[PDB]
Amino acid sequence: LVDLGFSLMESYEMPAQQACKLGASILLETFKVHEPIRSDILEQVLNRVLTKAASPVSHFIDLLSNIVVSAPLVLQNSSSRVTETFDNLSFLPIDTVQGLLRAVQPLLKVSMSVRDSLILVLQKAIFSRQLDARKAAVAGFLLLLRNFKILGNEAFCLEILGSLRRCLSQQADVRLMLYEGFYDVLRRNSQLASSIMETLLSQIKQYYLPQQDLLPPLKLEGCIMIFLQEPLAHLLCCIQHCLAWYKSTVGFEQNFEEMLESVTRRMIKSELEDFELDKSADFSPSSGVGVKNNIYAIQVMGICEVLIEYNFKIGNFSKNKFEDVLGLFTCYNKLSEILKEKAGKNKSTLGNRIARSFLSMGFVSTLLTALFRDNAQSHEESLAVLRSSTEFMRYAVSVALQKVQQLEEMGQTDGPDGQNPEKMFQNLCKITRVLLWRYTSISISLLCLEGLLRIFNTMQQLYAARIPQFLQALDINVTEKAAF
């Protein structure tokens, strides 16, 4: 049986998917059945697991994770391999490293030698001058930060805090992933949250440029040079998410809100003339000044999205915050429409209609519920004036349409809890109602037709076992309501 499965897994490389599923199932069954070959099977698959560096090994990591979660102590009896498994781990991260780490995580949390060896490898990984594979190292370290418990030795954390910060001055693509991944580990500790917030405060103050009634505070020229090395929209989104979590869990936080409030106030008390991009005929593609302005344009409207999200949480039925929100969007589309991106004569609509958004799925879910079906005397007409902004209506759902398309093709998506399916599934349940109802209200409705058509195609292809929950939330009579 084990020889058959070893042949099967390679034969899988549709029919290939069925063969891989069959091989994995028979290996899991024989591991759960054939007790005396458990150690030999584990050693053989570990030898095979690190056997296809160039070829995809996703099925390998899946089967290894299944056998490890079935028998947590199998690899413990398979010792002298926890240290060995890191031979060439930082070569081809295609999410393989993340899966391997997640599968072996119980072993690390019950194996101190493995933790020490990975710490030793961490110095070599993070200090790699090249950027071809340094992303895998930082991704693994970020996952490990949540891998170890935050009960409360704390000296371990106090030591490992500064390791990643030592590599903060890195490439923009490399600097990207820590911003997205810091929120996950921030919900696992209190002192670590303070330290991460302080480090991010230093980073943002590196670009804030405080002043009053003057030029736009964001020193956009810092990341101009040809390429860029300091993304700002992702950093600001991480800032707002970490601030929200820190406030919920319960002066840097006073500095955070003041800086956020000031920059939002600075943005509305500014215009394109205040920014470096004043005239329409200013920047052009394949131009040194053009691409610089092109990067600046890409950054600034990305910033506008983040401040929109933050003020919504702060402005609980607050017209003044809504007035700032609505005015902020007027700057966002001012760059768009006419000088969108640059111009883009290709009759194509990247990201539904706009570039990759920066809004948490919870917020856009809640924004539409406030925007549509959010009728009540509690609101102070802020929704109504928001409803007056017709382009705000179009942009309100257009971001989510890109978001669901991200989940449509890829199995994950940007924003907090994006890769959590059960958290996403609840969000998927709530969003669909307003999209369908808005169409039935009786252009804008044509957007909702795309939004629905993509939401079904996702859950039928992603949440196969979760369909009954959606059908219950749609309001085993599956056919009855579907025909309705």
Binding site: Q123, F127, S128, R129, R166, S169
Partner: protein, 168 residues
């Protein structure tokens, strides 16, 4: 010495020989105490110069030279970074001492110069013998802080063209 007086007042007492400095063994307490001492005693520019001279005299002493293998906290200071670099450059030709210095510089943090220490290392490799030059050059990935990546790469390619005896 002013550096010795500041160290005794706060931080690490004056250790003799290779013995450990009389400070807490941690990057937090020892560095904070050293920074407090440096802000207190050598605060005056003349006192700052006196402390720099005392630290240089201690570094020149073989006892503190063996102790360094405090000094680490002082080098971590932003002002002490150029001083530490100058001390290392001075001790390079005069002293596996160069190998130990290269290893210490390996995985180092941000110094006071992003495009000068690389030039100093290149000059030392040009002047230094075969093994010393090879050790210095092999540290370039650590020394390549992205401050002078491309230019140093071109200069190193030219040296390789002229360096057939040390191409590996």
């Amino acid at each position: 010495g002013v550096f010795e007086e500041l160290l005794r007042t706060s931080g690490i007492i004056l250790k003799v020989g290779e013995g450990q400095n009389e400070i807490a063994v941690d990057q937090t307490a020892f560095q904070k105490k050293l920074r407090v001492a440096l802000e207190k005693h050598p605060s005056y520019p003349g006192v700052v110069n006196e402390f720099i001279s005392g630290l240089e005299s201690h570094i020149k002493d073989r006892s503190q030279f063996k102790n360094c293998l405090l000094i680490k906290l002082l080098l971590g200071i932003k002002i002490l970074q150029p001083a530490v670099v100058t001390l290392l450059l001075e001790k390079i030709p005069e002293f596996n001492f160069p190998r130990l210095i290269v290893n210490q510089f390996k995985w180092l943090d941000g110094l006071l110069d992003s495009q000068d220490l690389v030039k100093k290392l290149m000059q030392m490799l040009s002047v230094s013998p075969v093994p010393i030059q090879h050790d210095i050059i092999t540290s370039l990935p650590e020394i390549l802080e992205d401050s002078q990546q491309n230019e140093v790469a071109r200069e190193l390619s030219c040296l390789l063209k002229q360096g057939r005896r040390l191409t590996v």
